[PDB]
Amino acid sequence: MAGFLKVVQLLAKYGSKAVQWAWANKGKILDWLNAGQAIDWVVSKIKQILGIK
């Protein structure tokens, strides 16, 4: 869970709703990281889902 919590910690700068989405989608995030997706790629993907631009 080291990559997952790095994702959540990087999202915390963006606020509670970003952290909220990450916890509810923990399995997606774990699956992306295990599929070879980088932590920074996952943070960007989540920001795109949230509409942070």
Residue numbers in the entry: 1 to 53
What does the paper say about this structure?
Tryptophan is frequently found on the surface of membrane-associated proteins that interact with the lipid membrane. Here, we describe the use of racemic protein crystallography to probe dedicated tryptophan interactions of a model tryptophan-rich bacteriocin aureocin A53 (AucA) by inclusion and/or exclusion of potential ligands. When proteins of natural L-chirality are introduced with their synthetic D-enantiomers, they can form centrosymmetric crystals in achiral space groups with high dimensionality, thereby enabling structures solved at a high resolution over wide-ranging conditions. Finally, in complementation to recent studies, this work illustrates racemic protein crystallography is an effective approach to elucidate tryptophan interactions of membrane-associating proteins.
Testing if the insights obtained from the study of AucA can be transferred to improve our understanding of other bacteriocins, we prepared a distant homolog, lacticin Q (LnqQ), for analysis (48% homology). A synthetic scheme based on chemical ligation was developed and the structure of LnqQ was solved by racemic protein crystallography (0.96 Å). However, LnqQ lacks the corresponding W3 residue and, as anticipated, was found to be monomeric: sharing essentially the same retention time as that of AucA-W3L in the SEC analysis. Indeed, the monomeric L-LnqQ appeared to be more sensitive to proteolytic degradation, as its enantiomeric D-counterpart is resistant to proteolytic degradation and is significantly more potent leading up to 16-fold of difference in activity. Furthermore, W41, which is equivalent to W40 in AucA, is anticipated to be most crucial for activity, and its replacement by a leucine residue nearly demolished all LnqQ’s antibacterial activity likely due to a lack of H-bond donation. For other tryptophan residues including W21, W23 and W32, their replacement resulted in a greater loss in LnqQ’s antibacterial activity, when compared to those of AucA. A plausible explanation is that the LnqQ is more sensitive to residue substitutions because of its monomeric nature, and so for future work the biophysical properties of LnqQ will be investigated. The involving residues, particularly W40 and Lys44, are highly conserved, with presence in lacticin Q25, lacticin Z40 and epidermicin NI0141.
